[PDB]
Amino acid sequence: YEHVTVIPNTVGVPYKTLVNRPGYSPMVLEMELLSVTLEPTLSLDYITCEYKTVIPSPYVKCCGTAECKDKNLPDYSCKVFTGVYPFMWGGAYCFCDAENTQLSEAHVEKSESCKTEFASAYRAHTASASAKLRVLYQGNNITVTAYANGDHAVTVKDAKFIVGPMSSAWTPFDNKIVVYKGDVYNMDYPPFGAGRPGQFGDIQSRTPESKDVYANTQLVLQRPAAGTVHVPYSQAPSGFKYWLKERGASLQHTAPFGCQIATNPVRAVNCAVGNMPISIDIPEAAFTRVVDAPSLTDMSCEVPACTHSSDFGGVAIIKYAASKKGKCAVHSMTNAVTIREAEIEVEGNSQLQISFSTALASAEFRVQVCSTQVHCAAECHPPKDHIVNY
């Protein structure tokens, strides 16, 4: 028998489902999404890190004029300064008084730190939802790990499970994402070859092993000081270093629905977006016939204690008169209240105690023990703590 139900995509919340196979005693299954993982498919656009302003020794051409050649290097800057007369510790470096030139050279490549300290620019698309659903099956807890695509059958104790497809294809992630160590950021990063100076992407490397890198760093070479050998320049400071302090709080702290964000691989854990359909093909052996199950008669219900809250603040005592000894399923016929126990051992002319959760001050609910219903009248009082820590 195939039982089809839909639960919200919320981790750590046990849900009760009533399995009613015609001509067979009702079955109550408790389902809880241990952990919900939303892993998006990533496509690496580029890597960014701190750049390296590579300034070699300046070419001081004594008694001659130096010539700047166009070099294919990121942020390549070249300038020849005339009327230079530089000095070293033991006097002037050039023989000539006039006609000496200084060629200043500079370019921006990946720093030695790029293998250790780096941010990755990814294209996030179509998140794959996965979740191991703890199932209270035959008085025992069973763990089912399946792809939430609706096309992955996992069989545990002869019961076939088909999880999903997810109602929402989203995930605390936009189309463009940025990853730094254990932190993920939603960022509309500039494309490769479009990075601005002093900003994220001032230096762009397609892969961390890449030889040719893109560079756009406002590098402007200045005229050296009188009688001084040095390469003065005006620039834009590291965009990656600037982003490291300007990034703000990561998705782990800003994402709605209490999403937990993890890396390697990047994923959204325990979020609250959309619902999850569940299909359970329960084998014939698990079911017990109505005649084989005890018959419930002369039922009465009393509520000695009730508090309307998120947890099981309600207590109900149900008196019964059972035809034989056996296991009976407990289920609330009113959607306003939920019962903690799924199965109880029935005896004879005895009574049972159940724990229930409700938000209503005046709780009117029907409890189905095996195949017979009993009305419960409850006057539930407000909780003491307005805020709870679960």
């Binding site: 702290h253 609250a272 805020i387 820590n389």
Partner: protein
């Protein structure tokens, strides 16, 4: 890199809100977030300060220094 932690503040609750009496011995980072709109906010607490934070139905996560984040939810 090894680090330390601060002390747990005296917590008092109200209707859809949490009240914390912060007693820091040194500068301590106080951060908090909500659901779909997290609305991340942060402040460095230097001395004795009382903080009133709104707890939405979706829940509120509060991080006080090097301590593990505190989670708050309203009662139904």
């Amino acid at each position: 890199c090894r680090v330390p932690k601060a002390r747990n503040p005296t917590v008092t609750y109200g209707k859809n809100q949490v009240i914390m009496l912060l007693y820091p011995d040194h500068p301590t980072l106080l951060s908090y977030r909500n659901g779909e709109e997290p609305n991340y906010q942060e402040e460095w607490v230097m001395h004795k300060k009382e903080v009133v934070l709104t707890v939405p139905t979706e829940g509120l996560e509060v991080t006080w220094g090097n301590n593990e984040p505190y989670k708050y939810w309203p009662q139904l």
